[PDB]
Amino acid sequence: GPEEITADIPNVGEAALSKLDESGIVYIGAEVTGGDILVGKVTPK
């Protein structure tokens, strides 16, 4: 099957997820740093 951009992903603390919105996309104006997550995408498996 395909993969999606769901906001939920495995084996990750909520800390990284704090910046994404319900959809799985970071809010406009957020101040990201090196090694962050911008859009959550999944391994279809």
Partner: protein
């Protein structure tokens, strides 16, 4: 011999609002350059300043956007605000507020100041509203610091904007030595220190501050 005349602060010529002069006298031979260079370095180095640190405008999210009604970019407003001059009496941190409507420039005087926060340049321009029914409100954060601090190296909501800190009143320091007119002696020196600050400091206080700083630092070497 084996005794040296102790200099004394003779006069403080407040030649202008900001430009000022100070005179130290007497001074034993050769000490003029020593003390002048030392004090110049100290004054230019470390002085308590009260530069602004954070901003919070009502209807914006990030500094790279624009606001309707105002004819300058948010970055321009922040830049101009960075060059602000102010003094605070008791507290080490304060929050100012600015609200303004109608058309025209926005001087620093438009702040709802309190009795402890004192602006030094009321006429400092900020921005030009170009519509009567266009207002701006903002909260300014003023901290007490020293030297320079880029916003990168410090330590929350998406509305806070962070500027760079430049806590330093002084801008230019020069000095000269010249023979004095003591009752009877030659090769007796007199130091004149010319300073030009941004205007938010008492020169005499600055000199006493630098001197006590230097003495306190130096006292380590004695009694090793």
């Amino acid at each position: 011999v084996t005794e040296f005349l102790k200099p004394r602060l003779v006069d403080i010529e407040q030649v202008s609002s900001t430009h000022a002069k100070v005179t130290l006298e007497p001074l034993e031979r050769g000490f003029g350059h020593t003390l002048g260079n030392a004090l110049r370095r100290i004054l230019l180095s470390s002085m308590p300043g009260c530069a602004v640190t954070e901003v919070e405008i009502d209807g914006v999210l990030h500094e790279y956007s624009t606001k309707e009604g105002v004819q300058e970019d948010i970055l321009e407003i922040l830049l101009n605000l960075k060059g602000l001059a102010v003094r605070v009496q008791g507290k080490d941190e304060v929050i100012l507020t600015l609200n303004k409507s109608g058309i025209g420039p926005v001087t620093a005087a438009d702040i709802t100041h309190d009795g402890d926060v004192e602006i030094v340049k009321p006429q400092h321009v900020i921005c030009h509203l170009t519509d009567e029914n266009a207002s701006i409100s903002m909260r300014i954060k003023v901290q007490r610091g020293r030297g320079y601090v880029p916003a990168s190296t410090r330590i929350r909501p998406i509305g806070r904007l962070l500027v760079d800190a430049c806590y330093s009143p002084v801008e230019r320091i020069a000095y000269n030595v010249e023979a004095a007119r003591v009752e009877q002696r030659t090769d007796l020196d007199k130091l004149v220190i010319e300073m030009e600050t941004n205007g938010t400091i008492d020169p005499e206080e600055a000199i006493r501050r630098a001197a006590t700083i230097l003495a306190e630092q130096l006292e380590a070497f004695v009694d090793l």
